[PDB]
Design a protein around this nucleic acid. Structure first.
Ligand SMILES: [Mg+2]
Ligand SMILES: [Zn+2]
Ligand SMILES: [Zn+2]
Lengths: 83, 49, 1358, 99
DNA sequence: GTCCGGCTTCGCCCGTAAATTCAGA
DNA sequence: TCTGAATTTACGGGCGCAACTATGCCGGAC
RNA sequence: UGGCAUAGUUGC
């Protein structure tokens, strides 16, 4: 479980961008298609996303990079299947 | 308030000068109120209800 | 969807466009069949179908007919949602004047026609005629004709002539005005006028006319011809028990407007006589006025049960209106309520939620889990499973509650810690278990309190609860830096008992091998919890680069202290647990742990502190008995001495030596002194009560008495309540803040006989009335503070401003209250702090002053630091992070986005309300000081005086003749060690610049009287006085002398009102003795009720008290009486006797001395010489004919208006004045508020500025505009070659500042909804909803927290 | 007392008040100030739009919760439309102008 | 039972506009 | 006899939050 | 099946 998010806040030093980043990451894990990048410990998506932020393997830049890579891969797959 | 006649002051809260006016109200058990009031010029006025 | 709200007058064409059909019949429902009428208020062809996709007569009843209109009745088959938003209209038989614009005060119609309100009221309601197009007659335009005048005009001016009557006449006048032409004449007249009041009226008229011209409105639209009708569902008829429908209010008003309209139409159809139609028109006007705003005109029409009907204005305004009842605060789903219990076993991050409320709140989540796991395919099955409370849905509930925070909120959410998120733990019960530590934040005792649980639903909301609102993130209060989770009463008692020592207990003097050995000994029963021993303690110091370094030593400690040391984390020193550990000690311990180690260690430390304190308080068995309230043996003799004192003072009073007021004051002061002496004797006998020895001689020690052990530890109670328990309980105060001079001589252990238990009830009634009647003042003040400061949000990180305020330690007249450590902590410096020695940069320019920097300042002994303030920020629409400073909820700088305005308003408003509701915690005892009467210097040092004009009397004793004399005890290093306030007429033992030693008085006076000490010698003359009306003289025939009292303005006669009694010092020849080297007489004016004991023509000497004015009593000095001062300060009230300041510098000269109103003139060196001031001659003047004066210098004494300070001394002067004045009030009550909040409130006060020179900009001459707008316009102008417009900042009250805002929605939701809406409609205002209140009302993301990024992105993607 | 979903008032589509009728707790004005003091913008938005008086918003949020997705469509409160109509019932033309 | 309609005063405070009263020319 | 400033008088707005229980809800012609 | 009024009460 989780008690305090202090270290995650230090990793994203705004206390407000942390909320948005964690919400995006949890949404990507709840709809979700994607899978957690940290060993799941019977946690809910929000806690797992926050722990991923704590481990230093999620942030706004990483999420943007992964989203762009997924978009490019989807475009390439669509083009190959069509043309 | 018991019916009768009562004299009060409104002690200086009016006229912003500290002068204590004086009012006399005749409260009936069943009827109309009659008030005799003073003013800063010390002129006795009356008002009904 | 949209980004702004536009408001303007509704033209008849627009009203018709809104409506989908005219309402003609005044019937709602048949009352036999529940169908709507044909074309009544509740209609189907006008407002839409009653049922979804069903025709009225049932011809069509399916979606396949979605859009077609039945021909039998004419109802557009569609959903019923449209019926909620379909408006109607009524074609008024005659034009009707809209009441809002008639009685807005100011009246729009009244001053658009330049006609007074009484006359336009007379014309509108058919009591007088008004001429239209007078032409070549004996009539003017706006002139008024009564029935006689109208008859005379008709019989004498039967030619072309028009004098209409009623709303039609006003509409004709409005339509016959050329707005731009009128603007031209009014403006050219304004330039060609000379008066000032007429100037104000003319500029107001010009402003209204230009507002009309600029906006798309027209004057005649102010008179209603087509009346809109609200959609039926917003004025529903809901069946009551039985056939009777709900007695709706809007329906009655609409239905008695249709009645009059139909009657008038019928009368005009048959050409009824003029009188009858006139009366019908008047009744129609009254009905429409009642519908629009009932009771505004007078005679609020009342329905059945004689209750005034709620009109549309009444529905949108007030506390019960939409803004403050359905838009700023709403009822919410997924919310429950329940009583709260303790549940000590909980951690700080979790709360005990009952299984039943957990099941009821999380029903949709349980349904989702059931569907996901396949236990219920259809939602009906899942609902049935949940309602049966099967054994499997509980497992689902445990699985879904794991990491789902729940908000817990207590009813009076005074500050932001009144709503906090906790992880639920399912509890078998019906009450919420609330962690003991957070109770202090909630102000939640467990004596019947109830709290509400809310469930965040979305992922964003859950993460906000987990990362912003978790109780483990709110360790520090947002108002100050102090921790808020400090253990309250049981934990602190347990720790105080644990960490304590006695001269002889079991296992004393033995040497232990560590804390573990101490716990083993204590549990084994071989050593007492409090016994002096030696323990090998290993403490970790992290003075290295983040490396914890161990240090092992042999500490002289106790068993309990060693046991407690096992709970402290590593990095803390050992001395932190080597004291008695009261409540303040534990608070400091937690604070230091937070600052040194971090957040998680602090949370764990707090939890362990709570557990160990509870355990060892249970072990201690600390109880309370009746033999613990020991009565002092000195109480009776103190009482007897006080009674002798009151007897002798009464004897003096009956002899006339003293008057009633000063006798009452003296009695109060001596009783307060006796009460303080009794309390001191009680505490002396109580603290050292125990002397214990079994190994030799007696040794005194701090007592183990339960009452003292709880009072000293700070667990519960203070000196006052223990005093009332054991010592005499002192004076009481009546509800009106009046102190009952009769004391209570008995404590609570003793009787309190019938008479004493009758004086007490006065104080008890005061305490309970202030809780239930005077809490509205604190709530109103905090609402005003929030609504003036809500859009202020941190936007930038640094504006690069070099301006700031000089923070210095505060010494109001005693010792240091708030040292420089606490006034500059967590605020960014403005300029480099040079070392006190020689020009060495001690701290850089833009460094945040955290704990280490403050300690560096302390050890280097700095006396004043210039820091960046919120009020001196160069940021437009917000505050940069640097000027604000430390967050005060976390240890870092304020994050970019956090809303500091709401935080400041809550911080300033919460303590007032909390203390108002806590006033009843001391019964009703009056909080009193000894009234001083002397100044005892405590430490050696030089003595200096500021703002002092003293004189030497006959006995060589220096006497202060100045009002604001400050006596500063300076140290040999030049640092002001102490400060004191020397009243006007005090005798100084020493002088200026003279050395003193501690414990010796340097000043003494009489606090109960204000003397009138002179400046020179001579004889006394009662000038400009007449016996009988100017003074009341009392004759002392037996002695032969006489006395007299000046009778104030209230008592003196109206005839000869202006007679000024004065004491004029004259020489033997009979001429005024001029004061040293001046040109005015030495005459001293006597204020009202001044006791003169002299006789005319009596010799006197310099420094002698001619007369003494009784100083009048000051009642109980608690929050209830001091909060009004704060409200006046934040409202910027002009004092009743403002001190007159010098607008400009230069030389001073008195002019004509016209009529007893002496003229002052300040001639600068080379500037504007002819500046002049009108000063009444009856008030004193500090500056006379000889000397220089800087602008903002005091010409006379008295309270200083903040407006004058802003105009003359500047923004920093006024903000410092406000901060100090409010902080005095909040220090008197022991309230700790950081100055950041007051500074931001002051900023929000001074947010407008008036132009003085238009410059090269496009502003008007003397208009008031937002300071930010003018500043940015000037910045843009100076960017080019033009020159910006010079401005003058204004100070506005919080109410006026909030109401005078660019957005009309924020002001409308605030007070004066009618006036704000009327002004916005007339001016055609447009709101960008860029604040917080507007976004709350509209229902979109707040531009403060996580929504700040969204709003910034939207602005970029505009 | 506890409520997840229940009957809503008529004039404004907000939860009913009290526990005799299956009502919801009032998120008062001071509670809104407290949430503004935090950075809790999404919590507040769902508190006063999706949980109180957004008929489409609350229905969609309920369906999403049942579907296992915790996301909301903000929408506009119905009480704001009520206020707009009440102001329009006077001679005042208040409108939400286009973007 | 079913259908139709227009006698209460009595609080404390403050801001602002209108009316009055000075105080002159 | 007029005219501006300051003073007085009249009058409109404000008067904390949350919660629970009960009763009563229109009077007069066909 | 939801509204207003009055009375009482609880926590501040
Ligand atoms: Mg309580
Ligand atoms: Zn039909
Ligand atoms: Zn700044």
């Amino acid at each position: 479980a989780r008690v305090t998010v202090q270290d995650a806040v230090e990793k994203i030093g705004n206390r407000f961008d942390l909320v948005l980043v964690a919400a995006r990451r949890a949404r990507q894990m709840q709809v979700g298609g994607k899978d957690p990048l940290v060993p799941e410990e019977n946690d809910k998506t929000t806690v797992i996303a926050l722990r991923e932020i704590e481990e230093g393997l999620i942030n706004n830049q990483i999420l943007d990079v992964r989203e762009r890579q997924e978009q490019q891969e989807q475009e390439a797959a669509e083009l190959q299947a069509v043309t | 308030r018991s019916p009768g006649v009562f004299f009060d002051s409104d002690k200086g809260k009016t006229h912003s000068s500290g002068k204590v006016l004086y009012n006399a109200r005749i409260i009936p058990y069943r009827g109309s109120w009659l008030d005799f009031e003073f003013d800063p010029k010390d002129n006795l006025f009356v008002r009904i209800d | 969807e949209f980004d702004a709200i536009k408001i303007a007058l509704a033209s008849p064409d627009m009203i018709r466009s809104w409506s989908f059909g005219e309402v003609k019949k005044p019937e709602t429902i048949n009352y036999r069949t529940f169908k709507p009428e044909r074309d009544g208020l509740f209609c189907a062809r006008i407002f839409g179908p009653v049922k979804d996709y069903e025709c009225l007569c049932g011809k069509y009843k399916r979606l396949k007919h979605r859009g077609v209109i039945c021909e039998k009745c004419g109802v557009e088959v569609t959903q019923t949602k449209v019926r909620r938003e379909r408006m109607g209209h009524i074609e008024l038989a005659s034009p009707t004047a809209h009441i809002w614009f008639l009685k807005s005060l100011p009246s729009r119609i009244g001053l658009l026609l330049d006609m007074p309100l009484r006359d336009i009221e007379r014309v509108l309601y058919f009591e007088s005629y008004v001429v239209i197009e007078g032409g070549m007659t004996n009539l003017e335009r706006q002139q008024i004709l009564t029935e006689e005048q109208y008859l005379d005009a008709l019989e004498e001016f039967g030619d072309e002539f028009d004098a209409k009557m009623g709303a039609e006449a006003i509409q004709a006048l409005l339509k016959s005005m050329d707005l731009e032409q009128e603007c031209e004449q009014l403006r050219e007249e304004l330039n060609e006028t000379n008066s000032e009041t007429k100037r104000k009226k003319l500029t107001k008229r010009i402003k209204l006319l230009e507002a009309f011209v600029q906006s798309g409105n027209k004057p005649e639209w102010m008179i209603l011809t087509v009346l809109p009708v609200l959609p039926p569902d917003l004025r529903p008829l809901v069946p009551l028990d039985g056939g009777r429908f709900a007695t709706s209010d809007l329906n009655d008003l609409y239905r008695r407007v249709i009645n009059r309209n139909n009657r008038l139409k019928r009368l005009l159809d048959l050409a009824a006589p003029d009188i009858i139609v006139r009366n019908e028109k008047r009744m129609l006007q009254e009905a429409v006025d009642a519908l629009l705003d009932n009771g505004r005109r007078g005679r609020a029409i009342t329905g059945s049960n004689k209750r005034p009907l709620k009109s549309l204005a009444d529905m949108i305004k007030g506390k019960q209106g939409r803004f403050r009842q359905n838009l700023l605060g709403k009822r919410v789903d997924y919310s429950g309520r329940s009583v709260i219990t303790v549940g000590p076993y909980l951690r700080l991050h979790q709360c005990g939620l009952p299984k039943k409320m957990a099941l009821e709140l999380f029903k949709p989540f349980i349904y989702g889990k059931l569907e996901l796991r396949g236990l219920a395919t259809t939602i009906k099955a899942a609902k049935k499973m949940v309602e049966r409370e099967e054994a499997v849905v509980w497992d689902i509930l445990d699985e879904v509650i794991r990491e789902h925070p729940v908000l817990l909120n207590r009813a009076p959410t005074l500050h932001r810690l009144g709503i906090q998120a906790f992880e639920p733990v399912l509890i078998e019960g019906k009450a919420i278990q609330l962690h003991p530590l957070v109770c202090a934040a909630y102000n939640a005792d467990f004596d019947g309190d109830q709290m509400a649980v809310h469930v965040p639903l979305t992922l964003e909301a859950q993460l906000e609860a987990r990362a912003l609102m978790m109780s483990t993130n709110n360790i520090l209060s947002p108002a100050n830096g102090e921790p808020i989770i400090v253990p309250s009463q049981d934990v602190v008692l347990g720790l105080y008992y644990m960490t304590r020592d006695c001269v002889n207990a079991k296992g004393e003097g033995m040497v232990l091998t560590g804390p573990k050995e101490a716990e083993r000994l204590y549990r084994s029963g071989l050593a007492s919890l409090h016994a002096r021993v030696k323990v090998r303690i290993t403490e970790y110091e992290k003075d290295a680069n983040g490396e914890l370094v161990a240090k092992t030593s042999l500490k002289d400690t106790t068993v309990g202290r060693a046991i407690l040391w096992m709970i402290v984390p590593k990095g803390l020193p050992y001395s932190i647990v080597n004291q008695a550990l009261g409540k303040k000690a534990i608070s400091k311990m937690l604070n230091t742990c937070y600052r040194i180690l971090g957040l998680k260690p602090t949370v764990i430390f707090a939890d362990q502190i709570m557990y160990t304190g509870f355990a060892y308080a249970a072990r201690s068995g600390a109880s309370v008995g009746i033999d613990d309230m020991v009565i002092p043996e000195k109480k009776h003799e103190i009482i007897s001495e006080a009674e002798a004192e009151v007897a002798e003072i009464q004897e003096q009073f009956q002899s006339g030596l003293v008057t009633a007021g000063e006798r009452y004051n003296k009695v109060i002061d001596i009783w307060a002194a006796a009460n303080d002496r009794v309390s001191k004797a009680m505490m002396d006998n109580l603290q050292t009560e125990t002397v214990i020895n079994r190994d030799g001689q007696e040794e005194k020690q701090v007592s183990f008495n339960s009452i003292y052990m709880m009072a000293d530890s700070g667990a519960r109670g203070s000196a006052a309540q223990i005093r009332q328990l054991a010592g005499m309980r002192g004076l009481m105060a009546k509800p009106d803040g009046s102190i009952i001079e009769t004391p209570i001589t008995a404590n609570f252990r003793e009787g309190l006989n019938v008479l004493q238990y009758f004086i007490s009830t006065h104080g008890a009634r005061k305490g309970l009335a202030d809780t239930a009647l005077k809490t509205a003042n604190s709530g109103y003040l905090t609402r005003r503070l929030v609504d003036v400061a809500q859009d202020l949000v941190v936007t930038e990180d640094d504006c690069g401003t070099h301006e700031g305020i000089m923070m210095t330690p505060v010494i109001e007249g005693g010792d240091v209250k708030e040292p420089l450590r606490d006034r500059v902590l967590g605020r960014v410096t403005a300029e480099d702090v040079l070392k006190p020695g020689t020009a060495d940069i001690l701290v850089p320019r833009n460094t945040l002053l955290h704990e280490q920097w403050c300690d560096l300042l302390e050890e280097n002994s700095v006396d004043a630091v210039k820091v960046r303030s919120v009020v001196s920020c160069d940021t437009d629409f917000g505050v940069c992070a640097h000027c604000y400073g430390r967050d005060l909820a976390r240890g870092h700088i304020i994050n970019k986005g956090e809303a500091i305005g709401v935080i400041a308003a809550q911080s300033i408003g919460e303590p007032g309300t909390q203390l108002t509701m806590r006033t009843f915690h001391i019964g009703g005892a009056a909080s009193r000081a000894a009234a001083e009467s002397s100044i005892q210097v405590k430490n050696k040092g030089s003595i200096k005086l500021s703002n002092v004009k003293s004189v030497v009397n006959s006995s060589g004793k220096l006497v202060i003749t100045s009002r604001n004399t400050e006596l500063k005890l300076i140290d040999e290093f030049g640092r002001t060690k102490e400060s004191y306030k020397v009243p006007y007429g005090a005798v100084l033992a020493k002088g200026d610049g003279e050395q003193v030693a501690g414990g010796e008085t340097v000043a003494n006076w009489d606090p109960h009287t204000m003397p009138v000490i002179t400046e020179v010698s001579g004889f006394v003359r009662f000038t400009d006085m007449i016996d009988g009306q100017t003074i009341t003289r009392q004759t002392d025939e037996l002695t032969g002398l006489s006395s007299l009292v000046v009778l104030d303005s209230a008592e003196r006669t109206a005839g000869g009102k202006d007679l000024r009694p004065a004491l004029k010092i004259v020489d033997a020849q009979g001429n005024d003795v001029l004061i040293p080297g001046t040109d005015m007489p030495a005459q001293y004016f006597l204020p009202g009720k001044a006791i003169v004991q002299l006789e005319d023509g009596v010799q006197i000497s310099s420094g002698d008290t001619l007369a003494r004015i009784p100083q009048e009593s000051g009642g109980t000095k608690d929050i209830t009486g001091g909060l009004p001062r704060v409200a006046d300060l934040f409202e910027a009230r002009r004092p009743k006797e403002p001190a007159i300041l010098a607008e400009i510098s230069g030389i001073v000269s008195f002019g004509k001395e016209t009529k007893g109103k002496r003229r002052l003139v300040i001639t600068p060196v080379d500037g504007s010489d002819p500046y002049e001031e009108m000063i009444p001659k009856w008030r004193q003047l500090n500056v006379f004919e000889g000397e220089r004066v800087e602008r903002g210098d005091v010409i006379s004494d008295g309270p200083e208006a903040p407006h004058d300070i802003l105009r003359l001394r500047g923004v920093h002067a006024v903000t410092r004045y406000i901060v100090n004045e409010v902080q005095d009030v909040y220090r008197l009550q022991g309230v700790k508020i950081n100055d950041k909040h007051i500074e931001v409130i002051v900023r929000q006060m001074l947010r407008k500025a008036t132009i003085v020179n238009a410059g090269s900009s496009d502003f008007l001459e003397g208009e008031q505009v937002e300071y930010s707008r003018v500043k940015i316009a000037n910045r843009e102008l100076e960017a080019n070659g033009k020159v910006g417009a010079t401005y003058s900042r204004d100070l506005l009250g919080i109410t006026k500042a909030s109401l005078a805002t660019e957005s009309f929605i924020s002001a409308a939701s605030f007070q004066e909804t009618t006036r704000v809406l009327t002004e916005a409609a007339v001016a055609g205002k447009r709101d960008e909803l860029r604040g917080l209140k507007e976004n709350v009302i509209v229902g979109r993301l707040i531009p403060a927290g996580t929504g700040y990024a969204y709003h910034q992105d939207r602005m970029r993607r505009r | 007392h506890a409520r997840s979903t229940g009957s809503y008032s008529l004039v404004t589509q907000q939860p009913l008040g009290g526990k005799a009728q299956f009502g919801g707790q009032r998120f008062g004005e001071m509670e809104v100030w407290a949430l503004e003091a935090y950075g809790a913008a999404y919590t507040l938005q769902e508190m006063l739009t999706v949980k109180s008086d957004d008929v489409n918003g609350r229905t969609k949020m309920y369906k999403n919760i049942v579907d296992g997705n915790h996301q909301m469509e903000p929408g506009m409160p119905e009480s704001f439309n009520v206020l707009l109509k009440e102001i329009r019932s006077l001679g005042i033309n208040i409108e939400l102008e286009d973007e």
